[PDB]
């Protein structure tokens, strides 16, 4: 129950439960498959 009118006044947000490290761990242009050779 929100007792207040504005959105800033609500409690903390709830877990992204998004999670996708590939923008950080695999930003390569041509896709690399694990097990296939790195450099062909």
């Amino acid at each position: 129950i929100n007792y207040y009118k504005d959105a800033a006044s609500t409690s903390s947000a709830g877990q992204s439960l998004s999670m996708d490290p590939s923008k950080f761990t695999e930003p390569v242009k041509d896709l690399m498959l694990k097990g296939a050779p790195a450099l062909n």
Partner: protein, 255 residues
């Protein structure tokens, strides 16, 4: 017979071929794109010179020697004088751009050495004076020359200490930023595609640089016996999806 290894990038009226690549990085897995309306604020129609600004400019070459500490260029600064890209830059109030960066360094199968090529969004430098000394404008706008981390402290300039990234963080952790290594034994170029990253939809191109490109020797250059002890490093950079807005009189900037 496609290898990760050979590549061709054609952009505008200029083409680059590498026969010894190590894939290419696209920052944060996003490719440069123009500014959508839903994200727009300034009401001005923007100008998109296209092929006259989105081509490859090769900056002047550096020389890696056994004593090198590393070099640093800022964008869009490094290009402030390249062809029509630069003119547009000084003539509009606001502009926006992504880039393809291609760093080149070839040697032979007897050399060793490994450079880190990294792009740091919003690289705010530190004053070597400490306290709250600022880093004057000119010092953070070296132009095509870039900053040479093995040059001496100057007054009003930034600190040039490599184990600290010019800001109080350790060299070892720069790997959290989009980056690629050039290991003479593997690699001969590094290519990074940079999407436009800012907290505003479009900004000023002269009062704010939005990425520093940094090339840092990490495993020292080691040449074969009685080889000349140095290799040149060349940086070629191409603006991509550039847009300029708010045209007028032509900025005058310090120094």
């Amino acid at each position: 017979g496609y290898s990760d290894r050979v590549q061709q990038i054609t952009l505008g009226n200029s083409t680059i071929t590498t026969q010894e690549a190590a894939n290419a990085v696209v920052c944060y897995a996003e490719w440069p794109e123009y500014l959508p309306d839903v994200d727009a604020s300034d009401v001005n129609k923007t100008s998109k010179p296209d092929t006259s600004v989105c081509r490859f400019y090769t900056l002047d070459s550096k020389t890696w020697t056994t004593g090198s500490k590393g070099w640093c260029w800022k964008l869009p600064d490094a290009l402030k004088d390249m062809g029509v890209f630069g003119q547009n830059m000084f003539f509009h109030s606001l502009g926006r751009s992504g880039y393809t960066v291609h760093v080149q360094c070839n040697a032979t199968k007897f050399h060793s050495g490994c450079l880190l090529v990294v792009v740091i969004p919003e690289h705010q430098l530190a004053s070597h004076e400490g306290g709250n000394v600022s880093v004057k404008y000119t010092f953070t706008h070296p132009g095509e020359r870039g900053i040479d981390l093995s040059s001496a402290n100057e007054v009003g300039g930034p600190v040039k200490d490599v184990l600290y990234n010019m800001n109080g963080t350790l060299l070892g952790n720069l790997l959290i930023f989009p980056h690629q290594f050039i290991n003479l034994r593997t690699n001969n170029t590094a290519t990074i595609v940079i999407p436009y990253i800012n907290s505003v939809p479009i900004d000023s191109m002269t009062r704010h640089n939005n990425v520093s490109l940094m090339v840092i020797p990490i495993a020292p250059l080691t040449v074969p016996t009685g080889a000349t002890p140095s290799l040149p490093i060349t940086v070629t950079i191409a603006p991509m999806c550039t847009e300029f807005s708010g045209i007028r009189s032509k900025s005058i900037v310090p120094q």
